[PDB]
């Protein structure tokens, strides 16, 4: 119900490139194959506020197609999207400072398999004793996998699930955005 | 039916300043009293195409509320707006190169009066004989009056009407956007 401070916000488009930005936030997007998608996403801060429409490029989306949820500052825009992933309602958004990469978490692997579990809470690549979880799957996300690199290490999006692992030592995000 | 060429278009916001631009077009806007409005509008070209929503900042407005009509490249945005004036369906948009000013046409005057005629076709400040029409009125537009400065001289928006003058002497716009 509250917009973020538009006085310190910016956005820009030029040809096939775009960006939404603030001193604690940066989302860089391109157009590839006629589709706009995120290539850069950095957050130094977690806050519950909404990107003002006055500073939004191409307001468009079915909200579920956004990547960064609207309630924590994600621009309601076609530019805020990653093909193969849907809105990260329970993403690791509190693990700031964060950056998104298209890259396997260290020591892990992700396979696309329709038999994999569906979307769940975002999960860290390491257990609560710092042991790496080697094998992950997703039903239909696009490769190379989306990964969040944040304060306490590497996290996967909702789509990507841990395999062959006890649940009790998993680390999940508390975010409900 | 056809969007403009996105590869050469651009748009940007920073704080209280914004702009939409192409090699043949420039709209500069800013936020005054919590409201966004055009401060600069230059066209080097007249074309019937639509500004792609992907390259539009703050897609929002009811369309009668825009200043530059959608069908000739006007960004469907709250940034494309001048208070006191509505969509220039019959503006002098063919008189390129054009620039919009907040300024009385040379040798003329504009007064605000409820009893004046309503919106009509945009009319040149001079007659077909090069004679200047000295007095103009508008029902409720805002001062200083907007004026279009183009190829064959100075024109007024749809809201600003010529007084004490004969219809046969008047030069009007053929634009229906």
Task: Name the features.
177 residues, mainly beta, eight-stranded antiparallel beta sheet, three-stranded mixed beta sheet, 31% strand, Genome polyprotein (chains A, B), viral protein, yellow fever virus
Please describe the topology of this protein.
2 copies of one chain form a homodimer.
Chain A: E1 10-14, E2 17-22, E3 25-32, E4 35-43, E5 98-102, E6 109-112, E7 123-124, E8 135-138, E9 146-150, E10 153-156, E11 161-162
Parallel strand pairs in A: 6-8
Antiparallel strand pairs in A: 1-2, 2-3, 3-4, 4-5, 5-9, 7-10, 8-11, 9-10
Function (chains A, B): Regulates the ATPase activity of the NS3 helicase activity. NS4A allows NS3 helicase to conserve energy during unwinding. Inhibits RNA silencing by interfering with host Dicer.
Subcellular location (chains A, B): Host cytoplasm, Host perinuclear region; Host endoplasmic reticulum membrane; Host nucleus; Secreted
Protein name (chains A, B): Genome polyprotein
Provide an overview of this structure.
The structure is a homodimer of 177-residue chains. With 177 residues, chain A is an all-beta fold. Chain A has one domain. Chain A is built from no helices and 11 strands. In chain A, the strands form 2 sheets. In chain A, strands 1-2-3-4-5-9-10-7 form an 8-stranded antiparallel sheet, with no helix packed on it. A 3-stranded mixed sheet of chain A has the order 6-8-11, with no helix packed on it. In chain A, a hairpin with a 2-residue loop joins β9 and β10. Chain A is globular and about 45 Å long. It is classed as viral protein. The entry lists the keywords yellow fever virus, NS1, viral protein. The assembly is dimeric.
């Amino acid at each position: 119900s509250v917009d973020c401070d538009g006085a310190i916000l910016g956005a820009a488009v030029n040809g096939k490139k775009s960006a939404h930005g603030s001193p604690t936030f940066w989302m860089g997007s391109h157009e590839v194959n006629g589709t706009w998608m995120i290539h850069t996403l950095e957050t130094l801060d977690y806050k519950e506020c909404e990107w003002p429409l006055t500073h939004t490029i191409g307001t468009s989306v079915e909200e579920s197609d956004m990547f960064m949820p609207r309630s924590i500052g994600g621009p309601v825009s076609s530019h805020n999207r990653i093909p193969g992933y849907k809105v990260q309602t329970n993403g690791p958004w509190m693990q700031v400072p964060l950056e998104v990469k298209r890259e396997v978490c260290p020591g892990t692997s992700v396979v696309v398999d329709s038999n994999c579990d569906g979307r769940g809470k975002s999960t860290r690549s390491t257990t609560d004793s710092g042991k790496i979880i080697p094998e992950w799957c997703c039903r239909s996300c696009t490769m190379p996998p989306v990964s969040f690199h944040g304060s306490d290490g590497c996290w996967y999006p909702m789509e990507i699930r841990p395999m062959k692992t006890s649940d009790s030592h998993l680390v999940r995000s508390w975010v409900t955005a």
